[PDB]
Design a binder for this molecule. Structure first.
Ligand code: HEM
Ligand code: HEM
Ligand SMILES: CC(C)(C)OC(=O)N[C@@H](CSC[C@@H](Nc1ccccc1)C(=O)NCc1cccnc1)Cc1c[nH]c2ccccc12
Ligand SMILES: CC(C)(C)OC(=O)N[C@@H](CSC[C@@H](Nc1ccccc1)C(=O)NCc1cccnc1)Cc1c[nH]c2ccccc12
Lengths: 452, 452
């Protein structure tokens, strides 16, 4: 099984029996992809256990996988388990059941439904400022992921179920616990990659990478909410759709996906931004000046004034370049195909190393340096959309891209209208990324906060 | 494998392929043991999957297993897994490592160390009264397991680490969460009994019936406490012992056992008592009168005045007869032996059905009726210590029996000095026991509480 890439003429590191190349994940996926990109070039291979993985870095070949041949060949991602009833979640579902779900859930994320969400997402930005001010009037540094997490949590439960909580002042509420509760290099998932034949063992055991309790809490919580608005957010838009149509437990599963999607991602991207803003204080001033020009007297951001801000889009995009939280994009090749002159055998995982491509000196000058001007309208043209892909690409890209950018930008506008963020003695500079299996900081980001 | 009891001449229900007799657990262990005791007699057999289990009800034969041949033959209980680092917990450990631990932990539970604990256990009884009074001055019924659990939780963290919390008013404290977080007939453990060859699968996966997070919280919490009192309760008595000696992670493991031991047990026995007191109001008055005679002016109970109360011991004992939380006692037979004229082959689990023996009409008149006078000093003599065994018997019996009886009695004395407990319209009468795999009520116990 370990002779595949040795046959196809594709180069790669020598796999060990059973382990494959996974000992090379000791420095984390990011550092391993970079070294492979360096040693090997435009295409290489390795083995997650006995699983072949082909990394590709040609943007034409990437467009073929993510777009051109998405429906025919590269339709699903690597099988993930054990998942239990979470098999019906859009990001996990496969082939025609993914296609059905993606459609039933697509109108949820239009710019029209997104503009209805602005006045609601704009209300918890104010709850955020007062929690910062209480820690700004105090003095003690601030841990961003705490305060940003509490905010991102407040946007989720409101934009997805209607529930309204100040989590930072209500850590022991009715749903704030369950909803705060996957390291792909921890003892568990490495044991998967080596023993992926033990996934089916756990699926007959009802054991789940989603704890059987959080899921049990929201499965019944939804069916209370469902039989409450009926008759008298995401949950509403999904229930209206099933009026081939969406099921009840299918509806719970997409809710659970939308929560992790907008909790740790939204709150962890904001912390990469605030770290970079705090360590590049001119970019902070330029941003503060642009907000006050569009929104004078700290005017409330509207859906339209947010898209009006260009230097804010440049800042977000550049932070997503340095910290693309997905790290890699992946598609399971389901047929023997020949894309851009290369034969891909059936069953091979095709992987795009986003992190490595975002930091490639062949496409980016000074790629470690935080330089937002790359995304100025003068230079935004010269950027290859299949090299910089923080939301993936093609029919299977991030369905909540628009919502995530709008959610994070409404947060930043209000927060930078009232605060400046300074490095602390305890602030990790330069921020070390987690040697583990997540795109997260080694030490969490602590910063000083001052009231304008 | 299913031909064993068919060969030995022992009667039993016909086992199905792979499942054995476990479909017969549908009404719970209790009802199944009673029916088997009824249909079959003094000795019978069944199969937990391919595991042979021999039930015995002769008190001479039981004394042989629990006492006479405990060290030689019947030393450990049924293998339990997956357990991870919790293998070193006294109740799980085996043979010489159990013997070493039982010794290193025995002086902890002397009546001398227990008398030092009284003034501390007496302090949270007052915290209990004021939480009841707030729900007694209000009116709304009271769920006993909530308020009793909060109390039992407060005694644990104090008598085992020194930490002091009012959990009922601090549900979101630093340790109250972790510490509040096994149904042997849920989807998981039935899958064990049928696939017990999958336990070793999980032990190479670090997966644990103890969540990897609660254990991680207390493993480090202990090693903070350890290097804090050093230098400047159970944890202290264990640390003094290791001065063949107790280890560090061994010390964490016994702490985790002492917590579940005194949290759900203590708080669930108190609720069986309060249910029975509320549904037999004369027994409540007789008890209230005896406390006021020993402790006039609601005098504070002392270690000695608690043992002075006889009708209180009768009440506890009779409640433990009707609801012996263990349900069964068990020992793995490690040699071919012939005890009381019966050949026991190696590897067979020997089981004593406590619940069924506590309700046997051959030893108890009106065994369902709650009749505390069975344990009056006139009739306490005529009770067979190998028929009524709420704490087991012999070298492997409950190490915290004395502590549990003292802990529960200090609770009852203070609570009955200030409250009467009435049935509510919502009170489940007659209380149905959980059809599941726990000795717990179907519906939780709700009762009215009135201030004396
Ligand atoms: C900064 C925020 C976010 C980033 C950078 C991000 C990034 C990504 C990426 C890279 C993918 C895979 C794309 C591919 O394979 O081509 C993805 C998929 C997905 N995202 Fe996001 N995401 C973010 C937030 C969100 C939010 C707020 C939601 C809310 C619903 C969401 C919902 C989803 C779903 C459902 C998928 C799977 C789509 C499918 O398989 O059909 N994401 N995201
Ligand atoms: C009403 C309260 C309790 C009851 C009815 C009870 C009952 C039992 C029973 C039946 C056993 C098995 C005995 C045997 O196999 O012969 C046992 C064992 C045990 N109990 Fe308790 N228990 C109670 C509370 C506690 C408490 C508060 C502790 C605190 C440390 C504790 C610690 C233990 C330990 C460590 C074992 C295992 C002993 C060994 O395997 O060496 N128990 N209990
Ligand atoms: C297994 C691997 C790495 C080879 O393959 C994956 O990718 N398995 C995905 C696992 S199940 C999809 C789901 N995970 C999740 C995680 C924790 C709790 C609940 C759900 C998901 O979508 N959460 C929202 C999200 C996260 C990040 C960006 N946006 C949206 C993990 C995954 C990471 N980023 C993805 C992007 C699209 C689809 C899946 C993923
Ligand atoms: C597996 C079976 C049923 C065939 O065999 C058992 O019995 N496996 C015992 C499991 S591991 C011992 C440990 N469980 C535990 C449970 C949850 C969290 C943490 C620990 C334990 O001791 N908790 C204290 C206790 C509970 C009840 C009375 N007193 C003390 C389950 C068990 C039930 N009652 C016992 C009495 C003695 C020893 C073990 C048990």
């Amino acid at each position: 099984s370990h002779g595949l890439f040795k046959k196809l003429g594709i180069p790669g590191p020598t796999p060990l029996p059973f382990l494959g190349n996974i000992l090379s994940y000791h420095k984390g996926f990011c550092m391993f992809d970079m070294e492979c990109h360096k040693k090997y070039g435009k295409v290489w291979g390795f083995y997650d256990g006995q699983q072949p993985v082909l990394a590709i870095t040609d943007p034409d070949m990437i467009k073929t996988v993510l777009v051109k041949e998405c429906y025919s060949v590269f339709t699903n991602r690597r099988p993930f388990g054990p998942v239990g009833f979470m098999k019906s979640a859009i990001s996990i579902a496969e082939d025609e059941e993914w296609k059905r779900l993606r459609s039933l859930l697509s109108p949820t994320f239009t710019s029209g439904k997104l503009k209805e969400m602005v006045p609601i997402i704009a209300q918890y930005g104010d709850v955020l400022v007062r929690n910062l001010r209480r820690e700004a009037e105090t003095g003690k540094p601030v841990t961003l992921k705490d305060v940003f997490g509490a905010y991102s949590m407040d946007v989720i439960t409101s934009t997805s179920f209607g529930v309204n909580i100040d989590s930072l002042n209500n850590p022991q509420d009715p749903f704030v616990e369950n909803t705060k509760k996957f390291d792909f290099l921890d003892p568990f998932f490495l044991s998967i990659t080596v023993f992926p034949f033990l996934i089916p063992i756990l699926e007959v055991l009802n054991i789940c990478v989603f704890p059987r309790e959080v899921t049990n809490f929201l499965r019944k919580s939804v069916k209370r909410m469902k039989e409450s608005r009926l008759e008298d957010d995401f949950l509403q838009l999904m229930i209206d759709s099933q009026n081939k149509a969406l099921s009840d437990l299918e509806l719970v599963a997409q809710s659970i996906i939308f929560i992790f999607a907008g909790y740790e991602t939204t709150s962890s991207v904001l912390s990469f931004i605030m770290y970079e803003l705090a360590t590049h204080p001119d970019v902070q001033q330029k941003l503060q000046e642009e907000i006050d020009a569009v929104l004078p007297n700290k005017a409330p951001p509207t859906y339209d004034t947010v898209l009006q801000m260009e230097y804010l889009d440049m800042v977000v995009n550049e932070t997503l370049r340095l910290f693309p939280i997905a790290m890699r994009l992946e598609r399971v090749c389901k047929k023997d195909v020949e894309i851009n002159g290369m034969f891909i055998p059936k069953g091979v995982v095709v992987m795009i190393p986003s992190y490595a491509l975002h930091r490639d000196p062949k496409y980016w000058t000074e790629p470690e340096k935080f330089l937002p001007e790359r995304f100025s309208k003068k230079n935004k043209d010269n950027i290859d959309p299949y090299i910089y892909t923080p939301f993936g690409s093609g029919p299977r890209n991030c369905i909540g891209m628009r919502f995530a950018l709008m959610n994070m930008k409404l947060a930043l506008i209000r927060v930078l209208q009232n605060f400046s963020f300074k490095p602390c003695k305890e602030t990790q500079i330069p921020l070390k990324l987690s040697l583990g299996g997540l795109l997260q900081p080694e030490k969490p980001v602590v910063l000083k906060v001052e009231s304008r």
